[PDB]
Write an enzyme that holds these catalytic residues in place. Structure first.
Site, PDB file in Angstrom:
ATOM      1  CG  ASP A 150      74.253  32.178  53.515  1.00  7.47           C
ATOM      2  OD1 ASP A 150      73.892  31.727  51.626  1.00  7.47           O
ATOM      3  OD2 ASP A 150      74.168  33.705  53.968  1.00  7.47           O
ATOM      4  CG  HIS A 152      77.477  30.163  50.341  1.00  6.36           C
ATOM      5  ND1 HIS A 152      77.377  29.921  48.685  1.00  6.36           N
ATOM      6  CD2 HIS A 152      77.583  31.801  50.424  1.00  6.36           C
ATOM      7  CE1 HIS A 152      77.596  31.371  48.439  1.00  6.36           C
ATOM      8  NE2 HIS A 152      77.862  31.430  49.503  1.00  6.36           N
ATOM      9  CG  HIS A 156      78.980  35.342  54.110  1.00  8.92           C
ATOM     10  ND1 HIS A 156      78.693  36.488  53.423  1.00  8.92           N
ATOM     11  CD2 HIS A 156      78.866  34.998  52.948  1.00  8.92           C
ATOM     12  CE1 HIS A 156      77.928  36.790  52.249  1.00  8.92           C
ATOM     13  NE2 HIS A 156      77.222  35.953  52.364  1.00  8.92           N
ATOM     14  CG  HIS A 194      69.821  33.586  50.138  1.00  8.88           C
ATOM     15  ND1 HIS A 194      69.499  34.703  50.166  1.00  8.88           N
ATOM     16  CD2 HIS A 194      71.002  32.998  50.923  1.00  8.88           C
ATOM     17  CE1 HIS A 194      70.972  35.261  49.816  1.00  8.88           C
ATOM     18  NE2 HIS A 194      71.617  33.905  49.944  1.00  8.88           N
ATOM     19  CG  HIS A 225      73.737  31.801  47.812  1.00 12.37           C
ATOM     20  ND1 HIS A 225      73.902  31.547  48.906  1.00 12.37           N
ATOM     21  CD2 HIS A 225      74.005  30.133  47.499  1.00 12.37           C
ATOM     22  CE1 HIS A 225      74.669  30.420  48.932  1.00 12.37           C
ATOM     23  NE2 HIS A 225      74.118  30.118  48.391  1.00 12.37           N
ATOM     24  CB  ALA A 263      47.916  28.311  36.451  1.00 16.15           C
ATOM     25  CD1 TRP A 264      51.471  24.428  35.034  1.00 17.93           C
ATOM     26  CD2 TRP A 264      52.002  23.200  36.296  1.00 17.93           C
ATOM     27  NE1 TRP A 264      51.004  23.244  34.290  1.00 17.93           N
ATOM     28  CE2 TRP A 264      51.130  22.517  34.834  1.00 17.93           C
ATOM     29  CE3 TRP A 264      52.066  21.972  37.410  1.00 17.93           C
ATOM     30  CZ2 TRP A 264      51.803  20.619  34.421  1.00 17.93           C
ATOM     31  CZ3 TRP A 264      52.197  20.768  36.936  1.00 17.93           C
ATOM     32  CH2 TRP A 264      51.403  20.215  35.750  1.00 17.93           C
ATOM     33  CG  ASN A 265      54.309  30.301  36.362  1.00 13.92           C
ATOM     34  OD1 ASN A 265      53.147  30.918  35.763  1.00 13.92           O
ATOM     35  ND2 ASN A 265      53.421  30.312  37.766  1.00 13.92           N
TER      36      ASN A 265
HETATM   37 MN   LIG Z   1      73.971  33.445  50.198  1.00 16.67          MN
END
Ligand SMILES: [Mn+2]
Ligand SMILES: [Ca+2]
Ligand SMILES: [Mn+2]
Ligand code: NA
Ligand code: NA
Ligand code: NA
Lengths: 261, 261
Positions: free
Chosen positions: B78, B82, B211, B76, B72, B63-65
């Site tokens: 950064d 970015h 950011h 997650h 992002h 089984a796999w996908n």
């Molecule tokens: Mn981000």
């Protein structure tokens, strides 16, 4: 004291007395991806990277992307649900497995000279035992990885898969090798090749024994490991944690090792 | 000795004297994803998981996908590229950054009470200094995360983004807070919200200071961190490593912390 262990570790990281080694290959369109016989099974897709914006009208102050990405792409992790033998584990997925297991000492078995001599080199139980006699017993919960320096082929997919009329030719373990490791109650087994099994593992008994046996025992696999030449045979810590994909069978990972230096 | 430290670490992981905490949320189609004003920027896509096979005629023994996946997405990382302020760093990409920096002690600043009472709660430099006064100074190369217990909304995107007529309302740092952390030469800043900045950061000066300023200084951001309530204020090691995406601006991660117990 557990706390002095962590503080000690934090300080040695900051000072570089403990080195972080990057055990991961570059994930992108040129990342080598498994090719199966098309009359046998569907293929996992090649990696795609699509720009959303780069400091432009689509996104003024920022740059970002999205991807078409198979679970089993580049340096990646095999969860037990990935194989029929491990289908019934409720903790066999990326989002349900026990993260306490994911970080552990790693045994780095160097078969790189043998691999260059014969692309179909097979690691056996006797060879693992010999390695143990030299370096020390493989212990419960530890990682075992086969170093072959196959990553030197990661810049060319055809060479990385190394196929001819009879199929893929790349090194890997025998069935008894895996059984013996599973008797040591290891957490998982890793390769620098496209998968955890030798290229010619389709004609083995059972077919794909790494995949088959590892997952039967609710254990993990790692593939496309880079830079195992920078690890020592003994004494390093391997960190190999899959993304928490919902019912994930696997995931690309950032495999990291901690070594002294 | 670095080696005696690594072995000790390994033993404590096995005995569970050092506990591995999962700071990652589930990655799937219901994973909350950032929404931007449509006249301002293209959105990053919702997560899709597509079946390749599940022990069927498309793949008999496995089984796999594959996934549609934004850099992002969910819990997650950064990378400095970015933001426009970090665009010129050659080591500013997921595949060019220094993995030595990725694993470090983490300061966990509990803002859960204030955030519960004020969704627009801001952490200030003064509040951070009072924090330091109580728990200890924030050190160079360290992680700093803001605990809001926002992960409790992760099951419902609308409640997680918490938007009304004037936009998203969710806790974050002031510019003064980020400027102060930078003077301490931290490695990066993490949140349990959709991003590193407060929902109202667009009207901040400068807009999106987390950011903007972190990436200006070649530092890292983490978003959608889970289970910061399981971490201590001090003493824990945070592992937050991005996939080695080619020229990646960020990556979903499997954030893991090491705590004593
Ligand atoms: Mn981000
Ligand atoms: Ca064959
Ligand atoms: Mn795989
Ligand atoms: Na903006
Ligand atoms: Na899309
Ligand atoms: Na098969």
């Amino acid at each position: 004291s557990a706390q002095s262990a962590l503080s000690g570790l934090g300080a040695k990281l900051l000072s570089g007395e403990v080195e972080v080694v990057d055990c991961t290959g570059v994930l992108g369109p040129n990342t080598p991806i498994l090719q199966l016989p098309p009359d046998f099974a569907k293929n996992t897709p090649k990696v795609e990277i699509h720009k959303i914006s780069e400091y432009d009208s689509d996104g003024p102050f920022f740059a970002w992307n999205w991807m078409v990405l198979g679970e089993h792409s580049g340096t990646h992790f095999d969860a037990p649900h990935h194989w029929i033998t491990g289908k019934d584990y409720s903790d066999g997925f990326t989002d349900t497995l026990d993260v306490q297991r994911l970080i552990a000492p790693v045994n780095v078995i160097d078969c790189s000279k043998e691999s260059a001599a014969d692309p179909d080199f097979l690691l056996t139980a006797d060879l693992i035992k010999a390695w143990e006699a030299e370096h020390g017993e493989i212990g419960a919960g530890e990682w075992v990885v086969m170093r072959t320096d196959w990553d030197k082929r990661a810049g060319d997919e055809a060479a990385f898969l190394n196929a001819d009329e009879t199929g893929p030719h790349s090194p890997g373990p025998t069935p008894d090798a895996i059984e013996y490791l599973l008797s040591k109650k290891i957490v998982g087994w890793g390769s620098q090749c496209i998968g955890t099994d030798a290229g010619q593992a389709g004609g083995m008994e059972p077919p794909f024994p790494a995949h088959n046996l590892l997952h039967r025992d609710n254990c993990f696999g790692l593939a496309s490991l880079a830079n195992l030449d920078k690890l020592p045979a003994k004494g390093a810590i391997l960190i190999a944690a899959p993304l928490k994909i919902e019912r994930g069978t696997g995931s690309p990972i950032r495999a990291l090792a901690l070594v002294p230096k």
